[PDB]
Amino acid sequence: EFLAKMTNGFSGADLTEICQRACKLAIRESIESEIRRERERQDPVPEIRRDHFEEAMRFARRSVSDNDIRKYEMFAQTL
Amino acid sequence: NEVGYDDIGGCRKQLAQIKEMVELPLRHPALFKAIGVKPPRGILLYGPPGTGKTLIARAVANETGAFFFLINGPEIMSKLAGESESNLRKAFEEAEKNAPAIIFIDELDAIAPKREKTHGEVERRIVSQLLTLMDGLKQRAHVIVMAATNRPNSIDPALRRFGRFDREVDIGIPDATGRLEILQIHTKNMKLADDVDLEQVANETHGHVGADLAALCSEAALQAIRKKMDLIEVMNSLAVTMDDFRWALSQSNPSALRETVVEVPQVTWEDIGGLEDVKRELQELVQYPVEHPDKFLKFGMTPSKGVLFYGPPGCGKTLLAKAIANECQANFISIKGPELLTMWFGESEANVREIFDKARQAAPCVLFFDELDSIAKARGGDGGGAADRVINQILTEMDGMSTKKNVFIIGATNRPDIIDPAILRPGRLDQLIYIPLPDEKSRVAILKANLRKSPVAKDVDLEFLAKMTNGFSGADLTEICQRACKLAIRESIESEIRRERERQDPVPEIRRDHFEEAMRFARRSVSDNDIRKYEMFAQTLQQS
Amino acid sequence: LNEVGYDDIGGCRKQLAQIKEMVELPLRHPALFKAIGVKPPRGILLYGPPGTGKTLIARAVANETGAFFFLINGPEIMSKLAGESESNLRKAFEEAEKNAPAIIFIDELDAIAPKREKTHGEVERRIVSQLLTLMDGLKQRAHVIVMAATNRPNSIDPALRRFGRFDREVDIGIPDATGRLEILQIHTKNMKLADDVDLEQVANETHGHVGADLAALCSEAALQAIRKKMDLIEVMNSLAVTMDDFRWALSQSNPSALRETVVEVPQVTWEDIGGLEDVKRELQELVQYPVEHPDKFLKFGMTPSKGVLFYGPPGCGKTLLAKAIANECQANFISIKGPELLTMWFGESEANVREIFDKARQAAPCVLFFDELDSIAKARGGGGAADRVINQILTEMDGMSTKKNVFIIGATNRPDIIDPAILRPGRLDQLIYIPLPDEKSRVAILKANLRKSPVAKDVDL
Ligand SMILES: Nc1ncnc2c1ncn2[C@@H]1O[C@H](COP(=O)(O)OP(=O)(O)O)[C@@H](O)[C@H]1O
Ligand SMILES: Nc1ncnc2c1ncn2[C@@H]1O[C@H](COP(=O)(O)OP(=O)(O)O)[C@@H](O)[C@H]1O
Ligand SMILES: Nc1ncnc2c1ncn2[C@@H]1O[C@H](COP(=O)(O)OP(=O)(O)O)[C@@H](O)[C@H]1O
Ligand SMILES: Nc1ncnc2c1ncn2[C@@H]1O[C@H](COP(=O)(O)OP(=O)(O)O)[C@@H](O)[C@H]1O
Ligand code: BEF
Ligand code: BEF
Ligand code: BEF
Ligand code: BEF
Ligand SMILES: [Mg+2]
Ligand SMILES: [Mg+2]
Ligand SMILES: [Mg+2]
């Protein structure tokens, strides 16, 4: 709910991209932990984390701009 | 050298289907008689070229106890009028009379051109005769007809409907396990070595189709033989090792991509200075999807696939592309901007379709759509009304009614503002990577990498050069180094010619005077206004 | 005595070794292959630019290999009757396999294998399907090797190009200096030429030739030598081709590839240009060092620069320098005016640009001269044909290519219009400025322009 409230101009594609980026960050952390564990030898992160979501929010972006979306409103107004 | 079901691998479901179909009715029709419904009596094998269709056909023919009849597609018709139909009738009647036999037609797309586009009356008559013979009155009893074709689309729907060719077994490309099994099958008959990693070879091999695995094995054997060229007690010790396996693997490319293979210069990640973030992101993006699919499946969402590079000209977009091509574990396809456009109507869309189909077939592949500016304008006095159609084709192919197994799209451009907003939408080109002009550390690294293999005197001050040059770019630094090298070579040539003339290694390393002279007239490549435009475009998106 | 042999092939060692390793060993002694276990390749395809020697290699292999040989001209299997082409092809293959472990050679198979998909007819489709099924299928091969030869292999079916039918596609590329020297030595084995000729030098000057043009040069030199004795035409035993004859033949001859782009050029030497000594020297170094001393560049481990741009007020010596280079430069020259490569058809302009650049790099080392660069490469901002062509030029000039050697010389007098992308270092790095003459430059140009003319001594320059 907080993420949705903060994001205003985003769209479903942007939200899906944020989720995918969070997943990629989680996988990167997991694989780094596993490789370090193996190296020291010779599921640390079972769930996506608030820090991962924070990074995704940090470097997410908006798909379309208000100036661009105005065109659809104008077309609807025309009819 | 008999070939049987033990000589085929990488196709379990399809092989099981064909096996049960060809055995159950033959081994005992009592069960099917008790059930009441007769089993199917027709199958069509379709797939990309060189997947194993003919191998399956010949294995079934040589292993089944029932009589087998073979009919090459372009073999029935003869000079005499009304002879192809007679030949077909004679073949079918002889086969059915002989025994509960099996008919195999190879490349029937040459004899069934859809019955609509064909012009010659012979083709229409033969296809109609085949249809009538397959489906008529009291036609067949205890006979199964096979098929094998590369283009199932160009077949008659009347022939493809149930009762003539009802089931279409898909013999597709294998996976890692399939490639491992195929390699085991091919290498079993030969004494390879005491130290081989077939699992590693299968992992490395990505877009091959079994026939290419056989080609790789043959190339490895040839390299092993040539390793004894000087020697040629040898045949006994002949073997193939990891060395020639790796050599053949490096030289091997999938048969599908033989059409669009172009040599590219060799470059390695150490050749690029700075851009640590971009390098790490590209490496992770191209590695994780094809390295740890289990984690992606467990988390439950497919990862990003597209990436776009936008920045001032002379930052290293093409250099990163070359590095990816040289040091990627996935097949690389290079396509220029307007290479897919032709004057004919719709042939540009046909080329786009076939290139994306090739990429999907050879997946995992990385597509480098260089000059997206040229490829796709924003939208639309149209110039032939084809740019819009091509752009729509690209959009729908990239994100439409498809699974999108594994195909990464990379775009390099320097005018992002003339790109259609749809392309930038997440899910197509979600990753917008910005490559700024190098800073002090980046310039130092770029110069050091550029001068990696060259005789350079110690008096040089790379830090001093980096501090002196502020707005320069990688291209500018490369040009400065090239100027220095040319001045050194000119000095060497003049000294050598003077010394030879006087008679009838003066300079072993480029020197500080050479660098000073070269830098005397260095010029910037990208203007303040252009860099400001790029930064503004970056800001309008970051602020979003 | 005139039969071509393996020694008759020159300028191709790696390709010849690749051909032999799979043509001779299986027929020489297959014991090693049997011991290894895996069968060797049984199909090869020769592809390269026209007139490289692929047909000569095929002829030598046919005339040297002991095993039975069979040949099939491509556009010759077809017959007027219906289905007769497949009958002929099947009979040829059957008799070839029955006779012995023979060799089948198909010449220009691209005329009988039209990709099976883009073709709209039916006879060609049936023929290609027959060929596919005949080479690959049940009862595949009785130890029979197939060969092919096409100048352009792209227009061939991918199924044909797949392993098992045509697996090894040896590329017979353009020769080098040593290859040209070997070709000249091979061709000049039946001439009482002289005791003073140095074929190495002639090979050095000969740059873009592809062997067939070397043969043409030798024939032209022989014709010149025989014509030189027209007055006397004791003569039969005195015939001989001299270094002067070779010089004349070399001066007259031009590479076959650049034949389509041959244009007359006025003869102007360096002395005809007044002043601009620094520009002349810099350009000479730029165009000479990469081709003259590549060893030093390799030692220094850096590729040389390949771009220069001429910009200045009209009437200063830009096109004059271009003419001087086209006349007195060792490398091949290609002159293209600005809008020559533009056509109304959709994409044909890009096709023309790609064709020209491919031809230039293929015939390298050559210097490509662009005139009205501001006209060809407009800034960025009728269907965007200008944008598409500029993008094509940029990408094919600095894309995923080896960029062997093509020097681009730019001439224009409106530099501001040209977009910054072209002027980036690495494409047209050198920005040479040609200003209006000073007093000394004016005196020098006057002297050069009055070099050959009757002028009274009273004239003061
Ligand atoms: N599943 C497989 N297992 C083992 N070898 C295979 C397999 N698929 C293909 N091959 C090898 O590659 C070749 C390609 O299959 P092939 O029967 O020629 O198919 P096609 O009829 O499409 O040309 C086979 O002849 C065989 O040598
Ligand atoms: N980071 C870098 N490190 C080393 N050389 C670089 C770097 N960036 C650019 N260069 C040099 O500048 C050239 C131009 O960069 P490139 O990737 O070709 O960009 P573009 O495709 O926009 O022309 C490169 O080919 C390379 O020679
Ligand atoms: N590598 C070569 N060595 C010697 N002579 C050559 C070579 N390449 C070409 N030639 C000469 O030039 C001719 C043209 O080459 P050729 O084999 O006919 O090629 P193509 O059939 O593609 O035109 C040859 O017949 C031969 O006389
Ligand atoms: N420095 C010069 N030396 C000799 N002739 C010159 C010189 N500058 C100009 N000319 C003469 O004037 C003409 C115009 O110069 P040119 O290089 O052709 O410029 P442009 O191509 O812009 O018209 C030359 O073709 C030549 O006839
Ligand atoms: F290449 Be096969 F005939 F599918
Ligand atoms: F010069 Be690059 F292609 F931006
Ligand atoms: F001109 Be050749 F036949 F390649
Ligand atoms: F007058 Be020139 F062609 F600049
Ligand atoms: Mg087949
Ligand atoms: Mg580029
Ligand atoms: Mg020929």
Residue numbers in the entry:
A (entry chain A): 673 to 714, 726 to 762
B (entry chain B): 199 to 430, 440 to 587, 591 to 714, 726 to 765
C (entry chain C): 198 to 430, 440 to 587, 593 to 672
What does the paper say about this structure?
The p97 AAA+ATPase is an essential and abundant regulator of protein homeostasis that plays a central role in unfolding ubiquitylated substrates. AAA unfoldases, including the abundant and essential protein p97 (also known as VCP), comprise a major subset of the large family of AAA+ (ATPases Associated with diverse cellular activities) enzymes that assemble as hexamers to unfold substrate proteins. p97 unfolds client proteins in multiple cellular pathways that include protein degradation, cell cycle progression, genomic stability, and membrane trafficking. Here we report two cryo-EM structures of human p97 in complex with its p47 adaptor. These findings support the model that p97 utilizes a “hand-over-hand” mechanism in which two residues of the substrate are translocated for hydrolysis of two ATPs, one in each of the two p97 AAA ATPase rings.
The five helical subunits (A–E) are well-ordered in both D1 and D2 rings. In contrast, subunit F is pulled away from the peptide-binding groove, makes relatively open interfaces with its neighboring A and E subunits, and has poorly resolved density. For both D1 and D2, the helical interfaces are stabilized by binding of ADP⋅BeFx (ATP) at active sites that, as expected, are formed primarily by residues of the first subunit and completed by a pair of arginine residues from the second subunit. All six N domains adopt the ‘up’ position. This matches the helical symmetry of dipeptides in a canonical β-strand conformation. Correspondingly, the peptide density is fit well by a β-strand, with successive substrate dipeptides making equivalent interactions with successive p97 subunits through both the D1 and D2 pores. Pore loop 1 and pore loop 2 residues of both D1 and D2 contribute to substrate binding, with the tightest interactions apparently formed by the pore loop 1 residues Leu278-Ala279 from D1 and Trp551-Phe552 from D2.
